[PDB]
Design a protein around this nucleic acid. Structure first.
Ligand code: NA
Ligand code: NA
Ligand code: NA
Ligand code: NA
Length: 1043
RNA sequence: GGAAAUUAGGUGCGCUUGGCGUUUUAGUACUCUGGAAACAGAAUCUACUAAAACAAGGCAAAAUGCCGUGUU
DNA sequence: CTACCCAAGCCAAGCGCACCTAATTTCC
DNA sequence: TTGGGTAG
């Protein structure tokens, strides 16, 4: 039939509501669910990618230093340098002789940790933060008379350690020390100047941001030109043309001419500047003064400033005129007419200055110009600052209309329109459905991008199954992400705690239990300092408590135009003032005779109220002092745009995409958005359950409410004015009072259909991506007990943190797990003493150090033992793991990584018994065009699971795939335990965590299913994006993945 | 609403580095044994320093070498 | 099996371009 | 939230 589509677009969900356009009965409703596309995910990938390069290039630096030492025959395979201490050698080499083994180990150590380059220049007063800027400053002061190696050696002898936060130095300080060392060791070893040059180079050299990665990288570029051209944007009017450099000469001339052509001069002659005038202006004030002032242009044209209007202006109110940057930058170093009067050359100098990023490359590229530039000039030009960014137009666009700017008075947009040049757009005439490719182009957040792409796919599926709707109404989340969302929640709860405490304070003080029924009026009362804002008369709290009906909550701006139901549009006033005011603004009401006070007296009170701590809302101030005319349509448009509709950038982009698609394919579909604040008002007034603990269906419930709102706006003729604005159609009945407003929207008994609806559908996005995180980073050592079991060795760090009770619980439950319990028991007894004395304290080690200022030290008869900074203890028995012991030679024990991230599991039915094979991310291998499962790993896993050749493959299960275990349908999380045949699932219509909360069940909030001989049946289900269920069938395990 | 410009603020993608962190091994300290000491042996607990590995792995051949946790 | 338990790499410094917001001038 | 070992 004819239907209205409502969309609730969220961070992790897209809820849709389908309701009849006439009957207002719900056809269908559901939720599309997916993971939040938060920026930290890709940040993690980029961060790891950067870390790999750092480690790779650091290693490559060392190898080259060693390869250099090999070539000069200071190092051999046979040469042994193990006992040597670099800090001792590096200091000794500064004034004495070193062995070929002792000298090289000093050079190698320097090459490994070479310090920073960029931080160097600027000192920072020490706020005692562990900042690089602060630390570098602190070391420089302490490096005044000493070299780096010297200072480190002193710290080593004096403090016992070198490494840490302090070990941050400038690269120059290392190089300075290296140079001195090489100068002294120069006499004792046969080295040429090529040696000392190559090493210093190797020590200090690092890639630049514009140089990028090496030759192979898909992230790299061939040269600086290709690098910049890829990044820079394209012209608005010529898409094929690259933008001009922001400060090209012709670009700024274009800017200056637009300024002059926008001017209006009041005089007997023409009000617009003639060509000869603009020529004189450009030459006599623009090419003469760096920052042209209004006076200079006025003096040139022989009028006063007051006669000149229509000029760009700064926030101070001072005129802003285009600065000819290149012209003056070059003029200052050279006044030769050969250079300055050459626009083309000035253009080329600007481009070179902007594209390339260092003086040296600038010089070379400037030299390649074969201009009339003196080399002395070129070197001077290369140090010019501020050549960054692009103009929004190409030189092609700029040069084309430059004469027109000179000889007409039309600005750029007037000329472009006259020339029939339209800003580039994307055609959707060919598209069979609403495209998803365009989303990134107009989006800022990764979170919003995914939500939009999913939203579009939801729409495309709905129109395919249901046909086109007349109306699409959309609401977006207030939060940009979940972290931001949680912050909103915290502030909400905190405010609630404050108000709830305030109410308790009143019932204890007055004994009037009525206060819990007057929260909003009390909130207003406290916020308004106990005065009626319209009469400025005092509102005694006792009278408010006893007779609350005498004091009315009035809406500042009438909701007939404001559509604002929030606390910001509410004021507690006397019933008499609220009655007299009617459908007016405070300004309109207080201007009339009906009012007790003048608007000025009112304005004064509000302004003082709006300043200071606990002040009135800023939005409230803007409302209370609204002096525009409410009946003016333009003003009504502003309020609708602020409070009734969603005019945020992301919303506009998506909405325009939909409208553009429909208009081009000539589809009569009306698209609109709605402010979340207004829908919340509806849900509140339509008496929906306050506590949203029903699970995912709330998203579909919201979309139905959103769809119902669209229905209401198309039902009434008084809402036709507002409906028109929401649908953005070009251009009367209207809501006249507060009471009328309530009648139209507060209709709780007309939406029972929504609440009674119980046919919600759910769609969970399935993840099948290969090569995600393969395994946890942490390296673990192992031990073998007397029983023969290999045990994981864990570390206890942060023993002196306040809230760290890990050690206390460990000793009370299992002291024998401490390796220190078996070896060095003297220290254990020393620890146990500390533990027993502060048993009540969460961390006995914290309170100790807090009181003594000293840490637990290893036992020594001389009381000179070392501090204990972390304690090893035995963990669980080793099982599922990654053996990487081979990376560590002659290691007495196994070295492992843990948590083998599963890709999927394949269920087999083997002789009436269900079993499954766990496919790890480690088992999926990449090829140039595709991923494939390791057959040797799969068969091995098949054998370890005792799967037989007779067994038949049932299905594969990825994350969020639907599974029916013994007749109950769940969604797959993943393999929880391969060895114990335990897979983890969750509920489809709700989280299992919340399900237990509703039941007040204290069981662990995780569903673990065991696939064993007691398992009766396993089926694989799936859904469309709308949440419609269906069963699947397959014959063999997919071993090839395309990516 | 759209076009250009000026200032301030913000978001993302990409690049370039720093010092940590985990682990092994070696040396030293610490503990234990013998000894007048030197020193040797044991232990590998705690600490410091150096060398090496750090998503499994895949390329690549003197290289400011390259890829491997994102999206679809 | 149920009902537990544990533990999971991290900060700081540059840079390019794209995009957005707010304010100001003109015009379409 | 999730790999996965543990007590009973
Ligand atoms: Na480009
Ligand atoms: Na620049
Ligand atoms: Na009055
Ligand atoms: Na940025």
């Amino acid at each position: 039939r004819n239907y209205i589509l409502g969309l609730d677009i969220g961070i992790t969900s897209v809820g849709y509501g389908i309701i009849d356009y006439e009957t207002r009965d719900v056809i269908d409703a559901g939720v599309r669910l997916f993971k939040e596309a938060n920026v930290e995910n890709n940040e993690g990938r980029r961060s790891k990618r950067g870390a790999r390069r750092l480690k790779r290039r650091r290693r490559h630096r060392i190898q080259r230093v060693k390869k250099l030492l090999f070539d000069y025959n200071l190092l051999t395979d046979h040469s042994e340098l193990s006992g040597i201490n670099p800090y001792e050698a590096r200091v000794k080499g500064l004034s004495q002789k070193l062995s070929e083994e002792e000298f090289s180990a000093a050079l190698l150590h320097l090459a490994k940790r070479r310090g920073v380059h960029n931080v160097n220049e600027v000192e920072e007063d020490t706020g005692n933060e562990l900042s690089t800027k602060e630390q570098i400053s602190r070391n420089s002061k302490a490096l005044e008379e000493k070299y780096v190696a010297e200072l480190q050696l002193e710290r080593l002898k004096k403090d016992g350690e070198v490494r840490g936060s302090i070990n941050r130095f400038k690269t120059s300080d290392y190089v300075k020390e290296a140079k001195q060392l090489l100068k002294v060791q120069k006499a004792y070893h046969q080295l040429d100047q090529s040696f000392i040059d190559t090493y210093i180079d190797l020590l200090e050299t690092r890639r630049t941001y514009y140089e990028g990665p090496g030759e192979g990288s898909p992230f790299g570029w061939k040269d600086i030109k290709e690098w910049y051209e890829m990044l820079m944007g394209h012209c608005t009017y010529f898409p094929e043309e690259l933008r001009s450099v922001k400060y090209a000469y012709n670009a700024d001339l274009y800017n200056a001419l637009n300024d002059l052509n926008n001017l209006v001069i009041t005089r007997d002659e023409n009000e617009k500047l003639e060509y000869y005038e603009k020529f004189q202006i450009i030459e006599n004030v623009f090419k003469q003064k760096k920052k042209p002032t209004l006076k200079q242009i006025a003096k040139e044209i022989l009028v006063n400033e007051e006669d000149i209007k229509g000029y760009r202006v700064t926030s101070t109110g001072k005129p802003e005129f285009t600065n000819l940057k290149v012209y003056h930058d070059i003029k200052d170093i050279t006044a030769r007419k050969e250079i300055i009067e050459n626009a083309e050359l000035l253009d080329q100098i600007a481009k070179i200055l902007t594209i390339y990023q260092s003086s040296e490359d600038i010089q070379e590229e400037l030299t390649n110009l074969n201009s009339e530039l003196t080399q002395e000039e070129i070197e001077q030009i290369s140090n010019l600052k501020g050549y960054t960014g692009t103009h929004n137009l190409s030189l092609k666009a700029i040069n084309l209309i430059l004469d027109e700017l000179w000889h007409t008075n039309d600005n750029q947009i007037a000329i472009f329109n006259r020339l029939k040049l339209v800003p580039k757009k994307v055609d959707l005439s060919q598209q069979k459905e609403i495209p998803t490719t365009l989303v990134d182009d107009f989006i800022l957040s990764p979170v919003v991008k995914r939500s939009f792409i999913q939203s579009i796919k939801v729409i495309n599926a709905i129109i395919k199954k249901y046909g086109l709707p007349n109306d699409i109404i959309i609401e977006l989340a207030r939060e940009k992400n979940s972290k931001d969302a949680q912050k909103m929640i915290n502030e909400m709860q905190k405010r609630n705690r404050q108000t709830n405490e305030r109410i308790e304070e009143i019932i204890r003080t007055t004994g009037k239990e009525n206060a819990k029924y007057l929260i909003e009026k009390i909130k207003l009362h406290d916020m308004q300092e106990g005065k009626c804002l319209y009469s400025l008369e005092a509102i005694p709290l006792e009278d408010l408590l006893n007779n609350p009906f005498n004091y009315e909550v009035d809406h500042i701006i009438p909701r007939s135009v404001s559509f604002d139901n929030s606390f910001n549009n509410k004021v507690l006033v006397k019933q008499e003032e609220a009655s007299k005011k009617g459908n007016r603004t405070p300004f309109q009401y207080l201007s009339s005779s009906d009012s007790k006070i003048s608007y000025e007296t009112f304005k004064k009170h509000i302004l003082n109220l709006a300043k200071g701590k606990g002040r009135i809302s800023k939005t409230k101030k803007e409302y209370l002092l609204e002096e525009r005319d409410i009946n003016r349509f333009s003003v009504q448009k502003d309020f609708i745009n602020r409070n009734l509709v969603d005019t945020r950038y992301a919303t506009r982009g998506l909405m325009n995409l939909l409208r553009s698609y429909f208009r081009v394919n000539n589809l009569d579909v009306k698209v609109k958005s709605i402010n979340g604040g207004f829908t919340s008002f509806l849900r509140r007034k339509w008496k929906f359950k306050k506590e949203r603990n029903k699970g995912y269906k709330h998203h579909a419930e919201d979309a139905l409410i959103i769809a119902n709102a669209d229905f209401i706006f198309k039902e009434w003729k008084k809402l036709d004015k507002a409906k028109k604005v929401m649908e953005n159609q070009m251009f009367m009945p209207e809501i006249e009072t507060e009471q009328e407003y309530k009648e139209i929207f507060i209709t709780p008994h007309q939406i029972k259909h929504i609440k009674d609806f119980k046919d919600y559908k759910y769609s969970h996005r399935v993840d099948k991506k290969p090569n995600r995180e393969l395994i946890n980073d942490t390296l673990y050592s192992t031990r073998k007990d007397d029983k023969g079991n290999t045990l994981i060795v864990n570390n206890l760090n942060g023993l002196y943190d306040k809230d760290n009770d890990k050690l206390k619980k460990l000793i009370n439950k299992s002291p024998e797990k401490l390796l220190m319990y078996h070896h060095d028991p003297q220290t254990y007894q020393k620890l146990k003493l500390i533990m027993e004395q502060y048993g009540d304290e969460k961390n006995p080690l914290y309170k100790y150090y807090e009181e003594t200022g000293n840490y637990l030290t290893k036992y020594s008869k001389k009381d000179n033992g070392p501090v204990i900074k972390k304690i090893k203890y035995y963990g669980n028995k080793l099982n599922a793991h990654l053996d990487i012991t081979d990376d560590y030679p002659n290691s007495r024990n196994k070295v492992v990584k843990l948590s083998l991230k599963p890709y999927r599991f394949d269920v087999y039915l083997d002789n009436g018994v269900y079993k499954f094979v766990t496919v790890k991310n480690l088992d999926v291998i990449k090829k140039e065009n595709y991923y494939e499962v390791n057959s040797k790993a799969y068969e091995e896993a098949k054998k370890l699971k005792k799967i037989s050749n007779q067994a038949e493959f049932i299905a594969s299960f990825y994350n969020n795939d639907l599974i029916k275990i013994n007749g109950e349908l769940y969604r797959v999380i993943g393999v929880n335990n391969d060895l114990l045949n335990r897979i983890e699932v969750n509920m489809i219509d709700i989280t299992y965590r919340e399900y237990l909360e509703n039941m007040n069940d204290k069981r662990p909030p995780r569903i673990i299913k065991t696939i064993a001989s007691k398992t009766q049946s396993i089926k694989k289900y799936s859904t469309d994006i709308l949440g419609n269920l269906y069963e699947v069938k397959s014959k063999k395990h997919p071993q090839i993945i395309k990516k």
